[PDB]
């Protein structure tokens, strides 16, 4: 969480064994639940084919990380 | 700005760890963690109560009852509601006595009750004066309206049509209006002879929307006042309005103390009315439509009502901002007002007809 104190394990030259973490750690997701997996499977089953369309090219270009605007 | 619940959890855990050295209360599924969470919840409730105790210190953010108490302490007095009244012209069929307290209801549901008993000795219409029981803005009606009869009378036709409608229906001032009046009072202190004093004097009289005061108008011993009534269509004073405003500034009783207050005895006020100085812009619109005509006109009117003062100079950018405030149009280039227009104190700027 917030302001959690951490210490080193193996000493390093000119490094003090102190870590503050002003911003808490984020993440920590456990395994998927049965309902979530069922929903993912139903998405896979029910999703349609997406043939190359002027709308679909925008999504395909925008899915790459970093790309924020696209035009077709 | 009370601390959040997570911040309270962290603070309680830090306190526990500081007081018990060598401990780590952040561990999952542990007694110290549970205790810290419970104490954090209690402290969050307490801090929310503290925040509610705050936020009512000032009348602006106070709740309803505390705002009313603040206004009553500061001396703001409410205006009570009135009741509508007028003639009825009820038609009978024989000699009868309409007892006092009878009621005529209009389609909407409002009920108008006769005050004094009336005795009729003919088979013809008779005019009686009735007053509403609602006591609100809904009391007053149009010119020829119909009123039915809640309970029948001995020989009176149920329907009753009023040739000349009722009038005198008003509403009690709302808390928003009371707050605005108190805010104005606090923002502009009363001194008895200041420019703000003259402005508030010229504004307190009924029907006046805006006023301005020029100190040392025509020398070191005189002042000047100029008021503009915006409710009326003309929006420029009349001689009767000017003389009545001069009378009000000269002398009027104070509702609080009951004594009469006014201008000093050595000054010359000479309140007067402004003269219109219209400006006619020429704005080009890409889509020409009545909706854009109305929107641009209303924006310009409001722009003037906001940022125009007698004797002041308005930059051409103001018109540009007012016309750009509209949504539908695409281009709004103005052509006539390309230079700064200025005027004297007697001259008041006004938005003339726009030549599209």
């Amino acid at each position: 969480g917030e302001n959690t104190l951490l210490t080193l394990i193996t000493p390093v030259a000119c490094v003090v064994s102190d870590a503050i973490t002003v911003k808490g750690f984020s993440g920590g997701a456990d395994i998927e639940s049965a309902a979530e997996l069922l929903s993912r499977l139903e998405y896979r089953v029910q999703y349609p084919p997406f043939g190359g369309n002027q709308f679909d090219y925008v999504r395909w270009a925008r899915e790459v990380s970093g790309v924020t605007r696209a035009w077709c | 700005s009370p601390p959040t619940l997570s911040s309270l959890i962290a603070r309680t855990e830090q306190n526990i760890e500081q007081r018990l050295p060598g401990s780590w209360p952040q561990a999952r599924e542990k007694t110290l963690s549970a205790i810290a969470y419970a104490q954090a919840g209690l402290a969050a409730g307490c801090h929310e109560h503290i925040s509610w105790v705050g936020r009512q210190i000032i009348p602006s953010t106070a709740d309803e009852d505390e705002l009313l108490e603040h206004c009553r302490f500061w001396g703001v007095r409410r205006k009570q509601a009135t009741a509508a009244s007028g003639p009825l012209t009820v038609t009978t069929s024989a000699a009868t006595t309409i007892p006092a307290g009878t009621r005529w209801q209009r389609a909407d549901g409002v009920v108008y009750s006769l005050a004094d008993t009336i005795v009729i000795d003919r088979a013809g219409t008779t005019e009686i004066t009735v007053t509403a029981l609602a006591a609100g803005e809904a009391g007053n009606t149009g010119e020829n309206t119909l009123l039915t009869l809640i309970t029948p009378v001995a020989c009176v036709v149920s329907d009753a049509i009023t040739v000349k409608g009722f009038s005198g229906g008003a509403d009690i001032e709302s808390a928003a209006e009371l707050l605005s009046r108190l805010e104005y009072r606090v923002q502009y202190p009363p001194f008895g002879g200041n420019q703000f004093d003259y402005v508030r004097w010229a504004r307190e009289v009924s029907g006046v929307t805006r006023a301005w005061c020029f100190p040392t108008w025509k020398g070191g011993g005189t002042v000047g006042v100029t008021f503009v009534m915006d409710n009326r269509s003309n929006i420029f004073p009349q001689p009767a309005d000017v003389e009545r405003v001069a009378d009000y500034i000269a002398g009027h009783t104070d509702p609080i103390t009951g004594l009469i207050v006014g201008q000093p005895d050595g000054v010359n006020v000479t309140v007067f009315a402004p003269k219109a100085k219209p400006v006619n812009p020429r704005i080009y619109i890409s889509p020409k439509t009545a909706e854009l005509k109305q929107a641009i006109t209303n924006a310009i009117n409001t722009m003037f009502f906001n940022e125009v003062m007698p004797g002041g100079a308005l930059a051409p950018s103001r018109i540009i901002r007012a016309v750009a405030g509209v949504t539908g149009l695409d281009d709004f280039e103005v052509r006539f007002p390309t230079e700064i227009q200025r005027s004297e104190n007697t001259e008041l700027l006004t938005a003339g007809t726009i030549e599209w």
Partner: protein, 143 residues
């Protein structure tokens, strides 16, 4: 799994263990709380003190049952069988709330005078077949 009460110098207190406090999930804490906290004396009882105050807890009117035991009435007694009988009765009354529920099957408490100046109480319960193994400790002294 609440905190456990540990006796040192004749006075119990909560204790730590590694990171946090020591925890207990057995009848030991329940018995050591139901036996050694003073509950409200009756109106007609004669207090051992010369005072007029009766102990208890501000939560006795919030917890549906008086908290502890009336063993504090025997603070200053002489070596007579009456005090032993009273101590036996008070322990039985304090711990009968367990037998009322299903947490114990039978209670057997006896009182005796061991080496001169000792009020010895022997309380033996009968835990049922499913009850967890209770905690185990001894009173300790230091300094």
């Amino acid at each position: 799994t609440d905190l456990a009460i540990i006796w040192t110098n004749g006075r119990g207190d909560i204790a730590q263990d590694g990171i946090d406090m020591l925890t207990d999930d057995s009848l030991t804490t329940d018995v050591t709380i139901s036996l050694f906290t003073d509950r409200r004396a009756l109106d007609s009882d004669t207090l051992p003190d010369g005072s007029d105050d009766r102990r208890g807890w501000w939560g006795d009117s919030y917890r549906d049952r008086p908290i502890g035991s009336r063993l504090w009435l025997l603070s200053r007694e002489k070596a007579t069988p009456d005090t032993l009988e009273r101590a036996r009765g008070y322990a039985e009354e304090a711990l009968e709330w367990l037998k009322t529920a299903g947490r114990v099957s039978a209670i057997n408490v006896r009182a005796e005078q061991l080496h001169q100046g000792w009020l010895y109480l022997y309380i033996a319960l009968t835990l049922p077949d499913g009850s967890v193994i209770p905690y185990e400790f001894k009173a300790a002294f230091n300094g």
